[PDB]
């Protein structure tokens, strides 16, 4: 109990092996959108969103409000620019706007951000395996790395099946939990009593981790960083045979992500009310809050033996498949965008070998980043939203500056990228060397009676992590706006046909 110990071991092993092996032996656009909702279905979200909802309440539902505002700008301000142009890759726009140097810089920033994000995405299934089997945290990470390598290197329509299965799993967990605790009315009343239904939270204090202001502002930009400029996600919409179909598929992706993040938050609330007494953290039954969901599944499905095995094997294999797909994606991007253009004559024999080698190097780098995440501390959702905000925040800032500011020469945008990246790294490192107090973040009390030294660690490093990506972005523009209009602007009369949004 509390760590498999039944047929669930066999079911987990069988499902993992089958997933690893069997991989390789207007509504037509709906699945494509549902394919990009499979990038936020990773075990990262499974572990994070429920735990964060349980610890901070229902405020986490405002994540959807970020999504609903990131797929509303991505489908009306960023998709037309990337479509009316017509681009093999989105970063090509930069070469059309400022110069090839900015294209290379943006590609490097995307590569770094993706490697860190995939490191976290690989760490999450390692956490699942360690919690489920008690197989250390380093042997578990080793096994996860080996399986991911077998996926990406040796070779590798489940993009929608994995979603469907994990979503029905979330709904099943919700139903079972609510049944155990009586009915929806009792659970809702209990959650309300313990201040878990604090949906309306407008406190302006930026240090407050989760709030309406924080979620809207920070999450919108942290989500544009992942689904508005991300080459892998956006590339699927520059080949939809029409702009309207691309927008419809993007809205379908928005709906899928909204459903995922609402089900996860609701199941997190059910988890909390289930553990309203004898909280695992206070009783030592687990180590980190990200070990909440596996524990919830294991405790709940004691009547049905293998269901935890099936659900967690899906959440593990799907997450590794997503990580391997991302690794292959950036391995291909490196060859097509950075290497091949410089070396024109290489022939395919060496190009395929270089692609495989880059996939291997990226896999190893992501595994090392996962090990670093495990060693450094905890937090999978926070880790993802920090790595993808610190790095991919200034990049979105550069895109927005180039679109909405006609007079943005290359030096201005480059210095804006520098300043934004520096500021984001500054705050993200300050908040890890002097983490904010738990009470100030907004963590709610969890009963168990049933069984900043410097001057910038108290006011600056304490901001919610969601603002990190919104802090670089809002600097990359401002600096890039206060330098472009000083180092000589770019007259709009000679800028390009459709590189702007005002046109």
CATH number of the domain within which 67 lies: 1.20.1730.10
**What is the rounded CA–CA span in Å between residue 480 and residue 102?**
13
Q: Could you tell me if residue 298 is inside a domain? A: yes
Residues with Cβ < 8 Å from 296, sequence gap 6 or more? Answer: 50, 173, 177, 267, 271, 274, 275
Q: Could you tell me if residue 500 is inside a domain? A: no
Q: Binding site for iodide, residues?
A: 49, 63, 223, 381, 385
Residue pointed to by tokens 């726009």: 93
Resolution (A): 3.3
Q: Binding site for Na(+), residues?
A: 42, 44-45, 117, 226, 384-385
Q: Could you tell me if residue 24 is inside a domain? A: yes
- CB-based burial, 249-262: b 16+ in 10 Å, e otherwise: bbbbbbbbbbbbbb
Q: Could you tell me if residue 501 is inside a domain? A: no
Q: Could you tell me if residue 139 is inside a domain? A: yes
Q: Binding site, residues?
A: 42, 44-45, 49, 63, 117, 223, 226, 381, 384-385
**What is the rounded CA–CA span in Å between residue 324 and residue 148?**
6
First to last CA, the chain: 63
**What is the rounded CA–CA span in Å between residue 183 and residue 169?**
19
**What is the rounded CA–CA span in Å between residue 62 and residue 199?**
8
Instruction: Taking each helix axis as running N to C, give the angle between helix 380-390 and helix 220-227, from 0 to 180 degrees, rounded to the nearest 10.
Output: 80
Q: Could you tell me if residue 154 is inside a domain? A: yes
Residues with Cβ < 8 Å from 417, sequence gap 6 or more? Answer: 102, 105, 109, 394, 395, 397, 398, 476, 480
**What is the rounded CA–CA span in Å between residue 162 and residue 170?**
12
Cβ(468)–Cβ(396) below 8 Å: no
Length of the chain: 503
Q: How many domains does the chain have?
A: 1
What was the experiment behind these coordinates? Answer: cryo-EM
Q: Which domain holds residue 336?
A: 7-494
Cβ(311)–Cβ(11) below 8 Å: no
**What is the rounded CA–CA span in Å between residue 274 and residue 187?**
9
Residues with Cβ < 8 Å from 337, sequence gap 6 or more? Answer: 89, 91, 103, 107
Residues with Cβ < 8 Å from 500, sequence gap 6 or more? Answer: 81, 403, 404, 406, 492
Q: Could you tell me if residue 421 is inside a domain? A: yes
Q: Could you tell me if residue 224 is inside a domain? A: yes
Report CA 23 to chain centroid distance, whole Å: 24
Q: Which two tokens stand for residue 53?
A: 């909802």
């Amino acid at each position: 109990r509390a760590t498999f110990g039944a047929w669930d071991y066999g079911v987990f092993a069988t499902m993992l092996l089958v997933s690893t092996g069997i991989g390789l032996w207007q509504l037509a656009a709906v699945p494509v959108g549902l394919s990009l909702a499979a990038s936020f279905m990773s075990a990262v979200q499974v572990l994070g969103v429920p735990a964060e909802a349980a610890r901070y309440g229902l405020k986490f539902l405002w994540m959807c409000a970020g999504q609903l505002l990131n797929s509303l700008l991505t489908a009306f301000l960023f998709l037309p620019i990337f479509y009316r142009l017509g681009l093999t890759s989105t970063y090509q726009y930069l070469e059309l706007r400022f110069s090839r140097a900015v294209r290379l810089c943006g590609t490097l920033q995307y590569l770094v951000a993706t490697m860190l994000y995939t490191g976290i995405v690989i760490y999450a299934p390692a956490l699942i395996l360690n919690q489920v089997t008690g197989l250390d945290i380093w042997a578990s990470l080793l096994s996860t790395g080996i399986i991911c390598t077998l996926y990406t290197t040796v070779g590798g329509w489940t993009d929608v099946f994995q979603v469907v299965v994990m979503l029905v799993g979330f709904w099943v967990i919700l139903a079972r939990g609510v049944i155990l605790l009586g009915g929806p009315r009792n659970v809702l009343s209990l959650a309300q009593q313990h201040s878990r239904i604090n949906l309306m939270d407008f406190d302006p204090d930026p240090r407050s981790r989760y709030t309406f202001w924080t979620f809207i502002v920070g999450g919108t930009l942290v989500w544009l960083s992942m689904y508005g400029v991300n080459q892998a996600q956006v590339q699927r919409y520059v080949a939809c045979h029409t702009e309207g179909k691309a927008k419809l598929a993007l809205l379908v992706n928005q709906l899928g992500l909204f459903l995922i993040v609402a089900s996860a938050a609701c199941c997190g609330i059910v988890m909390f009310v289930y553990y309203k007494d004898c909280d695992p953290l206070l009783t030592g039954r687990i180590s980190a809050p990200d070990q909440y969901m596996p524990l919830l599944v294991l405790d709940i499905f004691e009547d049905l033996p293998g269901v935890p095995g099936l659900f967690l094997a899906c959440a593990y294999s799907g997450t590794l498949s997503t990580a391997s797909t991302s690794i292959n994606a950036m391995a291909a991007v490196t060859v097509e965008d950075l290497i091949k253009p410089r070396m024109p004559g290489l022939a395919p024999r060496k190009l395929v070998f270089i692609s495989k080698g880059l996939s291997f190097i990226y896999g190893s780098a992501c595994l090392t980043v996962a090990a670093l995440s495990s060693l450094l501390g905890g937090g999978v959702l926070q880790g993802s939203f920090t790595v993808m905000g610190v790095i991919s925040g200034p990049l979105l800032g550069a895109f927005t500056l180039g679109m909405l500011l006609p007079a943005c020469n290359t030096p201005g945008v480059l210095s804006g990228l520098a300043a934004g990246l520096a500021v984001s790294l500054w705050v993200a490192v300050g908040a890890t060397l002097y983490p904010p107090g738990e009470q100030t973040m907004g963590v709610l009390p969890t009963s168990a009676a049933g069984c900043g030294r410097p001057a910038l660690a108290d006011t600056f490093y304490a901001i919610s992590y969601l603002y990190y990506g919104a802090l670089g972005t809002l600097t990359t523009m401002l600096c890039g706006a206060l330098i472009s209009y000083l180092t000589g602007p770019t007259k709009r009369s000679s800028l390009g046909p459709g590189l702007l949004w005002w046109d």
